């Protein structure tokens, strides 16, 4: 029962960052709520682990989410469960709330920015530190920030811009990345793009192109404001690289 | 006016897998200091997993991060209700320094992501106290057993899913409520000392979907009352 006035029962679509409330019907029994959100990569429901119900006072039929559901999760399906007992995990349903998140004052989902960042860590809502010069030894990080797209499958392909201002398809990834929380970092092994651009031919002006699989959302093309430069004559010392899997060991067994 | 060392054991049995045991000894030095009652949660030692000291890198990293909370200064009121954690800003600065030094030592994206994800938990004192309930000793020792209680098993069926258990009225033994009895089962037994000072407690909960089980046992070992 979404409230913000008082909206009627049923699943609703809400903009992010709005103070709303949920109501339940059948003194002041022990209400035990639970929160579920769709996993970005899996697409299946999962419990919100860091879900807290602050106790400002005595329990009331209405729960107030004044902080507003997160703009980073614009495009998710938040679900609230209630009851006098362990809440449901959703077909026996009488006490359940389904909210679909859309961007705050955003007309349509879109890729808000694509940059060549220097740090692998990435989070929504801030401008990541972008870099201009990288070497073939290093591993680049492509930071994609989108608005209103949560857990969206996206292809990314790397173009090269020559001295004549022509962008030609240089490389593409074998797998489509998934925009998780309106933000994603793609580790690009830069040696492959070098090899390919050396085959095709100062510095190499590598740009990026992000195309969602959905037809409605447009594509983002990188430009002079964010394009990386491969040094043809240079090498990292040991080399910005990815650490998602890490380096374990070389033991004897 | 009381102090001691409490042995805490958590045994979680998943379906189709062996039991997983976490055992620790919490050195807690309470102090009356009105309704004030400072326990200070002096230290946590002898952290054992499945009867052996932990060896995996991630578990050791979690223990290193969580050693900053000890010693707390939890402000228990009368029976276990932690009103606040007065030693929070010192804890916050200690944990920030620890996070900075792990980041400097090992710039791993997994550790960094863990740090950012815990930042929301530790950002505010109220949020820190709310997330402090995930500890078994803190949840079961700092709890008012008033014949109608609720316990959250924070990873009962799988890793990342909680489960709420409501215990009936019925040495202060309780029992799981009647609704959905074919899925929820178990019991809770608590035995006190002469004057409060919970001496032992064994609580078993059962998720019958084989039968996911979790048994929590707190025992007094080397108590001292002044």
């Amino acid at each position: 029962k979404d409230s913000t006035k008082e909206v009627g029962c049923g699943s609703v679509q809400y903009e992010a960052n709005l103070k709303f409330a949920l109501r339940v019907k059948y003194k002041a029994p022990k209400l035990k709520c639970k929160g579920y959100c769709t996993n970005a990569v899996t697409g299946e429901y999962e419990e919100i682990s860091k879900f807290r119900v602050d106790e400002n006072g005595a329990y009331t039929d209405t729960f107030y989410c004044d902080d507003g559901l997160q703009e980073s999760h614009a495009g998710a399906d938040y679900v609230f469960s209630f009851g006098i007992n362990n809440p449901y995990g959703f077909m026996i349903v009488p006490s359940i709330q389904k909210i679909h998140l859309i961007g705050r004052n955003l007309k349509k989902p879109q890729i808000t920015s694509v940059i060549w960042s220097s740090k692998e860590m990435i989070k929504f809502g801030e401008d990541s530190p972008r870099r201009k010069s990288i070497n073939y030894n290093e591993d680049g990080f492509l930071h994609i920030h989108a608005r209103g797209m949560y857990g969206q499958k996206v292809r990314v392909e790397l173009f090269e811009k020559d001295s004549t201002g022509i962008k030609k398809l240089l490389l593409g990834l074998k797998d489509d990345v998934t925009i998780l929380d309106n933000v994603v970092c793609v580790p690009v092994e830069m040696s492959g793009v070098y090899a390919k651009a050396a085959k095709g031919r100062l510095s190499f002006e590598i740009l990026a192109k992000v195309t969602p699989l959905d037809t409605s959302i447009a594509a983002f093309e990188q430009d002079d404001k964010s394009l990386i430069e491969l040094q043809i004559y240079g090498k990292a010392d040991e080399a910005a690289k990815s650490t998602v899997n890490g380096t374990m060991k070389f033991m004897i067994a | 006016n009381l102090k001691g060392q409490y042995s805490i054991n958590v045994s979680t049995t998943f379906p189709g897998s062996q039991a997983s045991l976490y055992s620790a000894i919490i050195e807690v030095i309470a102090s009356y200091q009105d309704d004030y009652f400072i326990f200070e949660l002096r230290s946590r030692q002898e952290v054992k997993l499945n009867g052996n000291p932990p060896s995996q890198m991630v578990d050791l990293f979690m223990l290193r991060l969580s050693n900053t909370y000890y010693p707390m200064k939890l402000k228990v009121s009368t029976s276990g209700k932690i009103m606040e954690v007065i030693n929070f800003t010192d804890i916050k600065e200690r944990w920030e320094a620890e996070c900075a030094k792990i980041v400097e030592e090992i710039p791993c994206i997994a550790y960094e992501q863990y740090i950012e994800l815990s930042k929301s938990n530790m950002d505010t004192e109220n949020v820190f106290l709310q997330a402090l309930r995930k500890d078994s000793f803190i949840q079961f020792y700092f709890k008012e057993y008033l014949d109608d209680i609720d316990i959250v098993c924070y990873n009962f069926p799988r890793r990342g899913e909680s489960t709420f258990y409501d215990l009936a009225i019925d040495i202060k033994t309780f029992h799981v409520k009647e609704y959905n009895s074919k899925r929820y089962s178990g019991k809770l037994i608590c035995e006190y000392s002469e004057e409060n000072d919970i001496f032992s407690l064994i609580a078993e909960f059962y998720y019958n979907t084989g039968q996911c089980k979790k048994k929590v046992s707190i025992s007094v070992e080397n108590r001292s009352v002044q």
């Binding site: 040696s191 374990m248 070389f250 004897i252 067994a253 | -």
Partner: protein
């Protein structure tokens, strides 16, 4: 089951993908290359001993 010599030539990228690999050879294995021979694992690499 090749009875003679089996030779495969690729003029561009060669990509294998399998759940488990076992490249047992009744002789010598010569994995020579011109760039980094990047052996990597999520559990580490052991040796014969």
């Amino acid at each position: 089951s090749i009875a003679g010599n089996l030779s495969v030539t690729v003029d561009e990228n060669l990509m294998y993908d399998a759940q488990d690999m076992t490249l047992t050879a009744q002789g010598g294995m010569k994995l020579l290359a011109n760039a980094k021979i990047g052996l990597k694992s999520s559990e580490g690499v052991d040796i014969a001993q």
